[PDB]
Ligand binder design. Structure first.
Ligand SMILES: *[C@@H]1O[C@H](CO)[C@@H](O[C@@H]2O[C@H](CO)[C@@H](O[C@@H]3O[C@H](CO)[C@@H](O)[C@H](O[C@H]4O[C@H](CO)[C@@H](O)[C@H](O)[C@@H]4O)[C@@H]3O)[C@H](O)[C@H]2NC(C)=O)[C@H](O)[C@H]1NC(C)=O
Ligand SMILES: *[C@@H]1O[C@H](CO)[C@@H](O)[C@H](O)[C@H]1NC(C)=O
Ligand SMILES: *[C@@H]1O[C@H](CO)[C@@H](O)[C@H](O)[C@H]1NC(C)=O
Lengths: 114, 49, 48, 97, 49, 97, 49
């Protein structure tokens, strides 16, 4: 019910790595599960922001959705795979301002262009 | 055995497989199911010496 | 260590073989349990 | 050797009994230092593992920063967490202390 | 002891992100027993033959 | 052996054998039970590390009591010791919503 | 079955399409999945092969 009929978000419950899909066949005294997981490799270190704010409008702030804001100025990457793409309204959410968010004054991403 | 002690009903435990089942549960009322009972024994038809 | 007892012990079949094998299996299970558990607690990435 | 040179620690010493009764206690699969290594590296992963979608990336963020996200995610607003950061750290410290 | 990838914390308003640049798929195989072999014993025969 | 001849000696030794065989069978049976029990329990620890330590849990009562924030793990003599830090509310008031 | 809210409806979608949703849901963006669809299928096939 958890691994075969659904994608699991439970670490280590199904297989190792990030669960994608599982299959089941019969075994001599039970069931044989084949859990297909996503296994990352070649990790790199990048510098990331907790969020970005419009320096001219400090209450207008965004945070990434299921990913990170990384330097390259700022771009978005999905959390599981480094692949920088523009920050857009489709990969961000509006948030309350925080002391850890960066003050962006020049090449602001579309969500902050008030 | 009835309340007055007389025997009015009985099972011959070796008569057949169903009788064996009732005797193993010491009851004239047993549940539905599939039960293992004593195997049908093979008997010698002769001897060798 | 008494030979007379050992002679009588043999009449009980491979008793000690069963004791030793059962405990061996249990002890291996414990090692597999530990190896499996720690394989999962282990982090792929961590801060110092 | 300890049970020959010093002998039983007390009555009913079940460790010295090993070499008398005919049983043996076996050592664990891992020593202490290795087990400690696993829980130590686990500690260092908490702040940066529990944070976002996916199990594949690691965000090396301050522990304190992680706690404030953990609290925000359960219904405490950011205005409250911001105003009370020192109060929260103190209460947390009391709980562990 | 196989050490994990070490990722340092920054003394700043930023953080270091360790993110994959490649991936593979893998299969974790698992066997879950559900049953045991069902056995019955003819006790009377076993003991007394 | 010192006191009896074979026809009686065997009977007395046989009493000790049956007693000791019974003891060893009982010992093994309990080690198998305790081993199985611990093995199940090891799985449970695995689940708690993955659910409570490496993640914030939304499962009431799975980790600690109250609302789960963060958990820590250290080694214990025969297992793991979990310290689940939860958020415990107090001084509830009633408001209209 | 694994696709959306509720256990009551069934979306008869291609297996491949399901996999791409499974990957998107764990942090791989759609631009990546679109560009690498053949690479992903190949890696998946290696894992099962
Ligand atoms: C991006 O812009 C934001 C907005 O300007 C900026 O965050 C702000 O930083 C200032 C500090 O420079 C914060 O102001 C104070 O900081 C001190 C730090 O010691 C706090 O102690 C203060 O708290 C007291 O005063 C508050 C009222 O002002 C009370 O509510 C509180 O209970 C305390 O009595 C206060 O926080 C300011 O709050 C933040 N803004 C927000 C929304 O948090 C940010 O730093 C800029 N980014 C970068 C990378 O510089
Ligand atoms: C650097 O770290 C020290 C603590 O070792 C801290 O007091 C200081 O504020 C940090 N500097 C910055 C810019 O955060
Ligand atoms: C990813 O890793 C595989 C080996 O597992 C290698 O053959 C392939 O070239 C790597 N791809 C990149 C972009 O590094």
């Amino acid at each position: 019910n958890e691994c075969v009929k659904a994608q699991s978000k439970r670490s280590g419950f199904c297989g190792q790595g990030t669960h994608i899909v599982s299959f089941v066949v019969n075994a001599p005294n039970g069931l044989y599960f084949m859990h297909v997981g996503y296994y990352p490799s070649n990790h790199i270190e990048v510098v990331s922001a907790y969020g970005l704010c419009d320096a001219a409008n400090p209450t207008n702030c965004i945070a990434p959705v299921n990913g990170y804001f990384i330097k390259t100025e700022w771009s978005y990457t999905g959390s599981s795979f480094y692949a920088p793409e523009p920050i857009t309204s489709l990969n961000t959410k509006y948030v309350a301002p925080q002391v850890t968010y960066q003050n962006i004054s020049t090449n602001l991403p579309p969500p902050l262009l008030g | 055995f009835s309340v007055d002690g007389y025997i009015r009903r009985a099972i011959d435990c070796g008569f057949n497989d169903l009788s064996q089942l009732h005797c193993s549960y010491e009851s004239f009322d047993v549940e539905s199911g599939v039960y293992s009972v004593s195997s049908f024994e093979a008997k010698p038809s002769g001897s060798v010496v | 260590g008494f030979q007379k007892c050992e002679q009588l012990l043999r009449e009980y079949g491979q008793f000690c073989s069963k004791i030793n094998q059962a405990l061996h299996g249990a002890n291996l299970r414990q090692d597999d349990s530990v190896r499996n558990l720690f394989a999962s607690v282990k982090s792929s990435q961590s801060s110092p | 050797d300890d049970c020959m040179q010093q002998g039983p620690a007390s009555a009913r010493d079940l460790i010295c009994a090993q070499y008398v009764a005919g049983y043996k206690v076996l050592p664990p699969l891992m020593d202490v230092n290795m087990e400690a290594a696993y829980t130590s590296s686990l500690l260092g992963s908490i702040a940066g593992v529990g944070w976002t979608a996916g199990l594949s990336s690691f965000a090396a963020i301050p522990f304190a920063q992680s706690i404030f996200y953990r609290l925000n995610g359960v219904g405490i607003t950011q205005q409250v967490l911001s105003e009370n950061q020192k109060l929260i750290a103190n209460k947390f410290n009391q709980a562990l202390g | 002891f196989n050490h994990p990838i070490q990722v340092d914390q920054l003394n700043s308003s930023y953080f270091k992100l360790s993110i994959p640049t490649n991936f593979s798929f893998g299969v974790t195989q698992e066997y879950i027993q559900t049953t045991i072999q069902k056995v019955t014993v003819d006790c009377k025969q076993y003991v007394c033959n | 052996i010192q006191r009896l001849d074979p026809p009686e000696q065997d009977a007395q030794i046989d009493r000790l054998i049956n007693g000791r065989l019974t003891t060893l069978n009982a010992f093994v049976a309990q080690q198998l039970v305790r081993s199985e029990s611990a093995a199940l329990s090891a799985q449970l620890a695995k689940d708690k590390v993955n659910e409570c330590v490496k993640a914030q849990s939304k499962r009431s009562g799975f980790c600690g009591q109250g609302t789960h924030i963060v958990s820590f793990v250290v080694n214990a003599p025969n297992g793991l010791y979990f310290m689940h830090v939860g958020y415990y509310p107090s001084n509830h008031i009633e408001v209209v919503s």
